[model samples]
Target: MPEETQTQDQPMEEEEVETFAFQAEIAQLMSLIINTFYSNKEIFLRELISNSSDALDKIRYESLTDPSKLDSGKELHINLIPNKQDRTLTIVDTGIGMTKADLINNLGTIAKSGEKAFMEALQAGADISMIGQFGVGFYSAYLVAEKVTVITKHNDDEQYAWESSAGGSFTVRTDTGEPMGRGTKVILHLKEDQTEYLEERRIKEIVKKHSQFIGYPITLFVEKERDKEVSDDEAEE
Candidate 1:
């Protein structure tokens, strides 16, 4: 059977979630990254943070001329949220995320149809997997994760998400969780033994390793303990 293009030119609000197998080319590429390419799995954090900086640079550089790109008023920065409570590390960026079409092309496939049809298809929640390309740095995410979920919003369209477990298939859908004006958020479901990446000590070292050259601010969200809260002790006359 040929590929199943889930939506035809009708209906746009009800069926908006589904999964697609990675195009053979993408499945092949992911296998190359997932199974055979890691000498140091720690490199995954470096790769992810570096990608966010690139995105912020694009948004910053592009904003110089487009101006409207700055309409969101979001400051460009990369925030590493290590939720040890949830066993996940989320890298959030205020940068250029993909338009719906780019979401398709950059992650798994491409849409060459004219704007109207493509927009309709994208809005209708059609799940498309076709001849593939791009996002190789993305797959390195599998080195430390079980599933990687990316939620992003582009200046030109609605927010969308792409999810994969580094298996033969992946998923794409409309997203509503924690909305943003423009940028991308990637959540890595780190392996049980891979919690090292979530530590402030390790995080500090990771940045000093490859993030030193990047100009953007890379910050980690940490909760420091309050050593003492005894207020009456200081008020004694």
Candidate 2:
């Protein structure tokens, strides 16, 4: 018998990356969405932007009654950060972020939309049956990215993170990334061929085309180019 093994002198990994497997039936639903996604993959951004808009709406609705719900931060906007060097596209929103339980409940299910959510999504009107068949809103990230990470802090809960590759398993743990007062930040590790999402021109066009009328402002955070040559107007951009 042949053996390949690590030396005992090597230090052990410390971080506890406790993993959880998606429900068996949900895995089937995941694959279904992946295959049934419309030929227009660009809609991934549309779906994501729509969800952020929904989250923003929910926060506003909650504030009407709670009054103090805005204690975290009143500023509302969906921030899109495209990091070409790290090859990650992050979507951030100032809204009602989810607690650990909320993360599982919201991100775990496919088409668990009861009455109100179903109607809202239905109003979007892209694909009728597909919307009812599966929860493609968050899952659609897989169409462009190989790995997805979400860091969020709810007004009622501590900061936590969830990461998944849609490989029938996912990990949840304390967030080690930048701390936010409140809201969800989604980082998508884009596939090699999906770099268009990282381009300012492409992102601006996509966001404009899909979410022009979305209730909240969709902001793009681009890196400042110091060394690159550019015209004054372009340089200002």
Candidate 3:
């Protein structure tokens, strides 16, 4: 008998395929950053905040070239919500989103990433020491989240959701919600040891530290409440 191919009852593939290429050493270097430099769980917050700043920068600069690119009425902002009821910490942004190629290329490996050339230069004995310029920041989420989810919407396409774990590999597919005006949302599933990252005060401190100077407004969702008080006499009346 010949080897048989497995087939699904549905469309065969749950997600569209995504691809990218990376240099071997640069690929290994990403693993080092994930294992070594990111011991502090709070670094995940820093990484997310930094990524948000970068997205804001891209939109602001693009707006210079095409004013239509900006969503003026919807002020650019980052929203972080920790739902204890649901045990999920979600960070959302309305900015430029990654297409199929982007999700693959950006998420695949650092070798083919934004600072790949720099890593090449560093390996060639140039003056550089930063372990990460690409994959490192995104990998920071792994420090706190056993599972991470990213939902995004680009101005030109439908919203997409990408999800993954530290084990290496992510899933990408079309999402079915009202499209975000424009931006990214990163949701981190809190691990047992990483619960502190879900605190509202900690979130605010982290936002102020890494994102205060960021041009876009940053908002963290907290428990909504009413402070109104009722007197006994008034109730009786």
Candidate 4:
């Protein structure tokens, strides 16, 4: 008997939005990391701040040879802004920002090779304090954020935005919004269950635990209520 072959009558056509499935059991593994690995959700802030410090160090190192590499008047620091009305927490850093390509490569991929080189440099006693060797730490933002938006501008390339809902897919686009001016700004839209991260005291404690010795200044901006002295004119009423 001759070998039988089966073929489709019509050619398969490419769809506008093609869905690619992950390899066997990988999705479950990703879920484990995103939800389970970081037992302490507060570590997310430390990870992000450490990454910012590393970025500032890189820009400072470059400025030694090329004076213009530093963003002129911008001081190297990280600012934490928590908006109670908006229910969002934003971290801004005056550091070497990512270009469109860098954002795609760095944010899209997990466990980057550069991190491996960073670890080797640490073992060799490199002077720079590049603390983030594990790229997955970046994903820890998902622990508190329903959505994460990164606005960044590189010295070599134009500003861009990278956003995701921790749904295994992220979107990147040319940012026409306010220029970041050679740094990165990360906004975390707080999750309902993670509101404690927005508290000033809670953030301070977390920073003291993991990022007190960080090279760059980490400023936490908070809203506080203060009693105002009533003027004599107002008291007369």
Task: Give each model a TM-score.
Answer: 0.68, 0.69, 0.64, 0.65
lDDT of 3 at 72: 60
Better of 1 and 3 by lDDT: 1
Stretches off by above 4 angstroms in model 4 are 1-28, 35-37, 68-74, 107-140, 223-237
lDDT of 4 by residue, 136-193 (tens): 4454356556888877788677777666665576556675446556688888888777
**In model 3, how large is the Cα lDDT of residue 25?**
69
What lDDT is reached at residue 83 by model 1? 64
Q: Pairing residues by index, what is the TM-score of model 1?
A: 0.68
- Tens digit per residue, CA lDDT, model 3, 110-148: 345454555575576653235464224454365546777
Instruction: Report, for every candidate in turn, its global Cα lDDT versus the true structure.
Output: 0.66, 0.68, 0.61, 0.63
Q: Give one digit per residue, the lDDT tens place, for model 1 in 57-92.
A: 877888898778467556677777776656777788
Cα deviation in Å at residue 10, candidate 4? 45
* Superior candidate under TM-score, 3 versus 4: 4
Q: Judge candidate 3 at residue 15 and give its lDDT.
A: 48
Model 4 TM-score, 2 decimals:
0.65
lDDT ranking from best candidate downward? 2, 1, 4, 3
> Runs in model 3 with CA error above 4 Å?
1-37, 68-73, 110-129, 133-140, 176-178, 223-237
Residue 63 of model 1 has an lDDT of 83
Flag regions of model 2 displaced more than 4 Å: 1-17, 21-24, 36-38, 66-73, 110-128, 133-140, 225-237
TM-score comparison, 1 vs 2, better candidate: 2
